[PDB]
Amino acid sequence: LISQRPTLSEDVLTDNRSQFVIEPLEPGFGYTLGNSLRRTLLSSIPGAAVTSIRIDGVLHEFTTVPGVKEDVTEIILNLKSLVVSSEEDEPVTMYLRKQGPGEVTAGDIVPPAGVTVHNPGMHIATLNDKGKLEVELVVERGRGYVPAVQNRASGAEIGRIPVDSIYSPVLKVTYKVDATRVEQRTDFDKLILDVETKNSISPRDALASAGKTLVELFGLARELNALPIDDLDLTVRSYNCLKREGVHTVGELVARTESDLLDIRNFGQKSIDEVKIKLHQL
Amino acid sequence: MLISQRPTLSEDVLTDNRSQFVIEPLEPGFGYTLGNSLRRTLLSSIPGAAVTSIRIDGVLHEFTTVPGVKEDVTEIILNLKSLVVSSEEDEPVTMYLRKQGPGEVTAGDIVPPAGVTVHNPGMHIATLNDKGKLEVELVVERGRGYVPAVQNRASGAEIGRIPVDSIYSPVLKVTYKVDATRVEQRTDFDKLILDVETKNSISPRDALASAGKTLVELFGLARELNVEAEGIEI
Amino acid sequence: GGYDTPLGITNPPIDELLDRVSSKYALVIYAAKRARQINDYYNQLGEGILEYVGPLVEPGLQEKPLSIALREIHADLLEHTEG
Amino acid sequence: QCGLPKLMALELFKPFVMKRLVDLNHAQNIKSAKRMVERQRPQVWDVLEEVIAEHPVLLNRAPTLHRLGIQAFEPMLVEGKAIQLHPLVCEAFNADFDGDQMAVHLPLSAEAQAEARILMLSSNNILSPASGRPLAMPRLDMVTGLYYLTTEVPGDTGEYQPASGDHPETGVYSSPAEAIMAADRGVLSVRAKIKVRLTQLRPPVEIEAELFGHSGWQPGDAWMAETTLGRVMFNELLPLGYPFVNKQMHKKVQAAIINDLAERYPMIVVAQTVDKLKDAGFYWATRSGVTVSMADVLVPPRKKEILDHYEERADKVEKQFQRGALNHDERNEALVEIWKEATDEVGQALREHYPDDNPIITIVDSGATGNFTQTRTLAGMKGLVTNPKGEFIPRPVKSSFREGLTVLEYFINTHGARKGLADTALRTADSGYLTRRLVDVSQDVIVREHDCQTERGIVVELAERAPDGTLIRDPYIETSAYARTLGTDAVDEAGNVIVERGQDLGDPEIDALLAAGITQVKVRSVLTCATSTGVCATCYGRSMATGKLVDIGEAVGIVAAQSIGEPGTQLTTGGLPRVQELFEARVPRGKAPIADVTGRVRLEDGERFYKITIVPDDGGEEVVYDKISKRQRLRVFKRVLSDGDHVEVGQQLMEGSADPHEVLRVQGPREVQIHLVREVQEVYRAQGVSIHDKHIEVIVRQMLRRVTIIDS
Amino acid sequence: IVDAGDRVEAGQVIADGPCTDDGEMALGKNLLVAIMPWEGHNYEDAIILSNRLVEEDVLTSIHIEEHEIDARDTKLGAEEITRDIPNISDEVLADLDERGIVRIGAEVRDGDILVGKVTPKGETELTPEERLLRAIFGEKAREVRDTSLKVPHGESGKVIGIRVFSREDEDELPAGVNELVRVYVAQKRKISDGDKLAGRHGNKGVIGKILPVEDMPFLADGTPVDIILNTHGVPRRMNIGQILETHLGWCAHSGWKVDAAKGVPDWAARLPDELLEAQPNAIVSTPVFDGAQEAELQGLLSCTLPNRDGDVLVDADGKAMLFDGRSGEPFPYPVTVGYMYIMKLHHLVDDKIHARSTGPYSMITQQPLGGKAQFGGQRFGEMECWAMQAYGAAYTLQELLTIKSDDTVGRVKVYEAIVKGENIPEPGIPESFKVLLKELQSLCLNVEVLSS
Ligand SMILES: [Mg+2]
Ligand SMILES: [Zn+2]
């Protein structure tokens, strides 16, 4: 027999992990609410990812760049674990150039302004004295998983390498419920939903986006449910007053009250009388 | 983003109070997400009035039957449980129904106080005969969902007070299913089908609207934390 | 009559077609001959109308002649003589 | 319905889609249409869907053991490259999803399309033509789920307990909607017995009569049902007019109810009911909580003591052999019998200790998978393992697969498994050859006329009497008596006519006959049909697949041949070689001499070849049987065989297998028909396969259609 | 698998091959597996998988196919490989270089041209309509016929490399051939429904359905299960060893530590040292017959140190509580979960899907060919004919025998009717029957047909 409104609270455990408490709820509603939130978070949270790459010395994914111990395919797979955050919807190109003996990571890639890389310490490849890596990554927004778009679909050349895209900043979402189940029927379900993201968006913001998406469809479910004064054949003083000052139609006169029209200086008593009788008439 | 179309709901009625809703087309995997939450909300969010406890004179500890009428205590409890009421006041109202001699005791012989209504007086309840004397006191209160009978606190004051289960929810039976229409051209979205059967107190359309505002304000409580959010357009 | 609305190919219930004909083979030949006549009428309709008559029931948007014929049989609109 | 790959359907329906897209002005001509079809332009799938719509297409899986191995369907377009099959037709196709592939064929003209969509529709083929039992049964997972949903658990949460003095029974629900609400809450369990009020389901016959009187218009009125919520849901799944069942539903129970539905309900409604049952069973299988883990399989605590006792017995018999009291064969026989006793004791102990809620026992008991021999081999001990010569190794495998086997134990198990894997591979080809011969010999007969108007028939025992006096039901009535036609009117003690001539003789007719008290019933069969070419419909009887009388153009011979040849691979001379020799009419290896005249017998134990003499009870001549082997035992009849025991004209004096030609020449054609039918039926049923007698009757009739000329 | 400074001894693995990890054979992947039934999508040995296996490229294979074509001298001259193909469009020649061979790395699909080769045909019988077309479109001589190399119907992919052989460059070739070209095409095939997965205990199965990651059972920690197998196939087939492997794999993945506070437990008495404490994601070896005992594995399951926070997802008997990904309610009973080794077999549906409407035919008899090498055509055998006869449907059998296999005029007329919209015409006499009649006549047998 609970009638108070539900409430939301947040508790951060880490920069990525977080724990949101929803309470109170109707008995049995917690499991369904948590499941719906998790299903939306894991699938329909927009993000950004790299879709196509290009190395100068290769033509397809099944070659090998000379001088680097890494293979092209396994370089692609290593690049699969890159997390980013873009602010521009259009495709954006970033560059990675390295030369000499060293371990090239995600910290040697220059992002153009307006986008952010977030895991620069991750390993990409290892070069030698003769090694030389030069790659270009094109990045777009999106949502969910989109497979590699065919090269012939766009006007891409031979060198372009399409790559699978995973726009999903949500990493791991789960939930639990605490049920009181008391004998006075003040029984409620407290939902505890813990969310972890891949360091690309606050789980707070991820749940904000999920909530907006949900309220979209649920609000869809909701919405089911004139004449000129001179034409009145007036006189000298009234005509002069309306001409010099600029009162043209009887609409403004019927909108203006007697106090609002008598404020004018050198106003005539005959003008007051005629305006009163004519507003009484029409 | 854009869902490439306008997901819409279409309702067709089957009985006086029974409807089928089709919500189509959604993003893939959203059929279950909407259906389960909608079913739970319909079942346990709509406020409504129901009977909680009864008290019939002539029985103190004998629970097998009552004199005069032929329907026993269990059957009479079943009939009173399967009765629809509507109360505009939160505090428990008390109803009295009395009949004498042979006759067909229905819901029409009940007397409701001001602010409370009975939405189907033509319900058979009892069949009195042979100098039958029926007197039933009912407690009606407003809640939500389904509530099992609670042990009476006023056992000493009212020894004959028998508590019964409360059907607070105006809706009776709601089921749902999903389908995968338009798979090839429209890249396999899904459609959701709801079948709702409710009492005559409220209709399926406004029942769905009520579940709607329950869920909308719940998720708006959830969302009204970062107003700048990215989602989908209708 | 206790069944629900049939879906697709079984839209005309098979039993309701059975009691209108002697046997399953007779029903098959029924439908095949009617579909042949309907297809001939559809193909030849541009020229002068021959003895073949088009569908007696209202055809759907794009409905097969076989299904149109089966609907005609269910509606009890044709008569046949056996061999 | 079946799901067809979109590329596969496009290639199959290429001319159709090409013509349609040319008509829709998407292409100027056929060359451009072909070009865009080959390049798979986006404007092809939209018209492909319309082309595919309601065009029947027929699937088939090799080998086609019986008629139901190739069935028509209405296809859809599904992204992917694998054909999506309905799970229910898997039993009919003998198809499993371990990797088996299927082929698809397209009927083109109106005749072929109508034939496919009328005769070959899957929903039109539920019952098996061979045995009448429906082949659209809920299979493993579905029966497991239905069993879990239907079983009643005593002392469960939310049960109904009657109470008085302080509170009412607090277990009675007003409506299934309220029951569903309670089950949604934690108060009520699905498998908890309660009392509910039902207003739609028809109650069983007894309560319906005793409550509503003559008129049973129950789906309008209301009544009280003492049952579980799962049974209420199952009855809601069932058609509205069906009476309430209120019983835990085994595989046999589901078979019985589906057979009754097919018997007295339309094909469309029974197909829809089967679909609903499949959906509900699949939904409830997951929630049954049936899974296998290391702790699920349990071992009997008494296993070590039982094994030690039987090992002591084995040591005793081994010592006795070492003393010289018996030979190697006797030692092997003693060890085999004592280890069989040990295996039986271990299995009994495992069954007694094993709980009734464990997933393994639930699966075994529900009728879904395996059986208790598999369960005992898994947990317990496997026991005796066959030698490559077919004998039994004296030392069995004491351990089980749960505890792991030893090197030699695995070696002998591999021996047996390899022998089995070779024999099944040979048996497949042998059965194929047998069914090829059967169909080639039996393709002649078809139904040619409605009735041949004959009077001669066949005597059926139909639940013979008992010495104490009662009608004990014959174990095999559905095979012989069911789905036949009366040859003569049935009368009890020259009284009222129970069932008239020319009746289908179904369940009510058989029940009425048993109530009247007559057993020997005259029937009409193909063995005595008077039609010159083929057989008439009435003599053949009711078509055993469609549930009605056979049509006037059915290929009954081909159907019979397929029905007999289909279960051959299940057989394992007492199996497929035995039935092959029976159908080839060869002289049996165990040649048992047959009597030639009703008379008194005299038997002398000769020099390993006994001498038998039959003296006729009339002015006949003494017949003699001399050249026999001492290996064959003495046939029992009546009791036991005794010297001087007068025997009939055709009594089998020696156990084994009699000669069909001899039994024919000494007892006419009717006796040889009876002998052949009974022998084939018992050979088939010794493995667990039921086949109606009419198929073997057709084959035997084709067998006995000739005569050998003596004088020119 | 080595570094730039590490020392290596004789016999040490330096580089791993196709199915090798760190120098040991690895034919599959470790997958989190639940062994409960699910909605019938795993019914009858079917297998359910998560979409994360498709996403993370857990189960993907590289398949390389080679295509060969040779230029050989003929009686009319010498066929030559050239990008100048008569009467062809310009867009289709974009991927061909000046040599006439598809450029390396150019994406290719079905119906395209790999090698541009043309042969000297000169001219044949030109029908009047063809003469009119040539003389109205003003075509030149078009003296040659283009039997160029095209990709087989039913596959696509990228081009890896080209090897060119020519006798003008000292390369040895079979007599009569002056040029040989082989083109390598590779496809990064992904896992999909219809593919055959298997374990190490004979528990094979096709992929019934690939589920979204959100709509799958997940433990209390929130990790979804990767693969779902039916529970009805284990007890019947007697392969409990797969469940034993599942339990041991979960134990190895989670790590373990036997608490030797007061001596080692009885079940761990004979257990070898260095096995009482294993870090997460450790690797253990179980010899086939001197393997891990049931009591030892039970104890290892008992000591199953938590994953990240304090939580033991798997209880003592190897089971766990799973949350349904569709309805969200917890599953009523715990189900067994673990880690199992799953391998992708070479039975990909891409190599088994086949369909045919009209293709080539044999010479002696006009039946369609067989096999995916040609365009195929299904074998309607004697058993299928028996089933057709048992059904009583004669027209479909007559069609499957006459106008789909043998009757040439029947085939031509049925195609013409099916394109023009009219009904299918009457079947004729099969060509195989006439072939049999002529064969019987050739055996000095006077066989004829009498009309009355
Ligand atoms: Mg299989
Ligand atoms: Zn007859």
SS (H, E, C) E378-441: CCCCHHHHHHHHHHCCHHHHHHHHHHHHHCHHHHHHHHHHHHHCCCCCCCCCCHHHHHHHHHHH
Helix (H) or strand (E) segment spanning residue D431 = helix D407-442
Torsion angle of the four alpha carbons D669, D670, D671, D674, in this order, in degrees rounded to the nearest 10: 120
Q: How far apart are CA D501 and CA E269, in angstroms?
A: 82
**DSSP code string of D315-374:** HHHHHHHHTTSS-HHHHHHHHHHHHHHHHHHHHHHHHHHS-SSSHHHHHHHTTSS--HHH
Q: How far apart are CA E40 and CA A65, in angstroms?
A: 48
For chain C, how many structural domains are there in total?
1
Identify the residue whose tokens are 């724990």: A19
SS3 content of chain B, % helix, strand, coil (to 5): 20, 40, 40
D109: chain C residues, CB-CB within 8 Å? 32
Q: How far apart are CA E63 and CA C37, in angstroms?
A: 53
Q: Which ligand is nearest to the CA of D523?
A: 2
D117 close to D123: Cβ distance less than 8 angstroms? no
Beta strands D172-173 and D193-198: pairing type?
Answer: parallel
- A182 CB within 8 Å of a chain B CB: no
Beta-bridged to residue A116, according to DSSP, are A85
Q: How far is the CA of D95 from the centre of ligand 1 (A)?
A: 6
Q: How far apart are CA D606 and CA D603, in angstroms?
A: 9
Among B7, B44, B222, select the one facing A26 at the smallest CB separation: B44
Q: Are residues C43 and E393, on separate chains, in Cβ contact within 8 Å? A: no
Selection from D560, D540, D544, D537 nearest residue D448 by Cα: D537
Identify the residue whose tokens are 């600029």: A246
- Taking the mean position of all CA atoms in its chain, how far away is CA E444? 52
- In chain A the domains, ranked by start, together with CATH numbers, are 1-46+168-225 (3.30.1360.10), 47-167 (2.170.120.12)
Q: Are residues E51 and A145, on separate chains, in Cβ contact within 8 Å? A: yes
Q: How far apart are CA D57 and CA D77, in angstroms?
A: 13
Q: What is residue B101's three-state secondary structure? A: coil
Burial of residue B119, with CB atoms counted within 10 A of its CB: 0-12 exposed, 13-18 middle, 19 or more buried: middle
**Cα angle, residue D687 at apex, residues D686 and D692 outer, rounded to 5°:** 75
Selection from D385, D403, D381 nearest residue D395 by Cα: D385
Beta strands E144-145 and D172-173: pairing type?
Answer: unpaired
Q: Fill in the amino acid letter for D546.
A: T
Q: How far apart are CA D272 and CA D420, in angstroms?
A: 41
Chain length of chain C? 83
- A203 CB within 8 Å of a chain E CB: no
Torsion angle of the four alpha carbons E83, E87, E89, E93, in this order, in degrees rounded to the nearest 10: -10
Q: How far is the CA of D702 from the centre of ligand 2 (A)?
A: 15
D90 in a labelled binding site: no
C2: chain D residues, CB-CB within 8 Å? 239-241, 265-266, 269
D529 in a labelled binding site: yes
Identify the residue whose tokens are 């004088």: D711
B172: chain D residues, CB-CB within 8 Å? 175, 177
**Structure-token pair, residue E43:** 């019914």
**Structure-token pair, residue D463:** 């639940």
CB atoms within 10 A of CB D217: 8
Q: In this structure, is the dihedral angle defined by the CA atoms of residues D671, D675, D677 and D682, taken in order, positive or negative?
A: positive
D536 in a labelled binding site: yes
Q: How far apart are CA A209 and CA E263, in angstroms?
A: 55
Quote the longest CA-to-CA distance of chain D: 102
Q: How far apart are CA C72 and CA C53, in angstroms?
A: 12
- Taking the mean position of all CA atoms in its chain, how far away is CA D173? 41
Q: How far apart are CA B224 and CA C12, in angstroms?
A: 54
Q: What is the resolution of this structure in A?
A: 3.3
- State how far residue D125 is from chain B, nearest Cα, in angstroms: 26
Beta strands A161-162 and B166-167: pairing type?
Answer: unpaired
Contacts of D227 (CB under 8 A, 6+ apart): D193, D194, D196, D244, D246
Identify the residue whose tokens are 């034993």: E244
- State how far residue D164 is from chain B, nearest Cα, in angstroms: 6
Q: How far apart are CA E105 and CA A57, in angstroms?
A: 12
- B29 CB within 8 Å of a chain E CB: yes
**Per the omega criterion (within 30 degrees of 0), is the bond before D63 cis?**
yes
Beta-bridged to residue E71, according to DSSP, are E179
- D184 CB within 8 Å of a chain A CB: yes
Q: How far is the CA of C40 from the centre of ligand 1 (A)?
A: 46
How many Cα atoms are found within 13 Å in the side-chain-facing hemisphere of D188? 26
Q: How far is the CA of B128 from the centre of ligand 1 (A)?
A: 66
Identify the residue whose tokens are 């009919």: D92
Q: How far apart are CA D359 and CA D365, in angstroms?
A: 10
Contacts of D202 (CB under 8 A, 6+ apart): D208, D216, D218, D219, D240, D241, D242, D243, D244
Identify the residue whose tokens are 């050739």: E442
Contacts of A261 (CB under 8 A, 6+ apart): A253, A275
- State how far residue D61 is from chain C, nearest Cα, in angstroms: 23
Q: How far apart are CA D610 and CA D601, in angstroms?
A: 13
Q: E157 — alpha (psi -120 to 50), left (phi > 0) or beta?
A: left
B36: chain A residues, CB-CB within 8 Å? 32, 35-36
CA-to-CA separations, D224 to B5, B137, D188, D221, in angstroms, rounded? 50, 25, 18, 11
Among B43, B151, B184, select the one facing D181 at the smallest CB separation: B43
What phi and psi, each to the nearest 5 degrees, are found at residue E4? -90, -5
Q: How far apart are CA C78 and CA C58, in angstroms?
A: 15
Q: How far apart are CA A84 and CA A171, in angstroms?
A: 14
Identify the domain containing residue C55 by its residue range.
1-83
Beta-bridged to residue A165, according to DSSP, are A146
What phi and psi, each to the nearest 5 degrees, are found at residue D29? -155, 175
- A32 CB within 8 Å of a chain D CB: no
CA-to-CA separations, B205 to A187, B44, B146, B179, C60, in angstroms, rounded? 29, 17, 21, 22, 33
Identify the residue whose tokens are 């880490």: A14
Q: How far apart are CA D235 and CA E105, in angstroms?
A: 63
- A216 CB within 8 Å of a chain B CB: yes
CB atoms within 10 A of CB D385: 18
CA-to-CA separations, A113 to A83, A93, A169, C39, D341, in angstroms, rounded? 16, 11, 21, 68, 84
D184: chain A residues, CB-CB within 8 Å? 28
Which chain E residues have any C-beta within 8 angstroms of a chain C C-beta? 392-393, 395, 421-423
Chains A and E touch (3+ CB pairs under 8 A): yes
**D450 DSSP 8-state letter:** S
Looking at chain B, which subunits does it touch, using at least 3 CB pairs closer than 8 Å as the criterion?
A: A, D, E
Which of B32, B40, B44 should we substitute to test contact with E (largest number of E Cβ atoms within 10 Å)?
B32
**Structure-token pair, residue D256:** 């019985």
Residues 393-452 of D with CB under 8 A from B: none
Find the closest chain D residue to B187 by CA distance: D79
Q: How far is the CA of D455 from the centre of ligand 2 (A)?
A: 9
Q: How far apart are CA E400 and CA D58, in angstroms?
A: 12
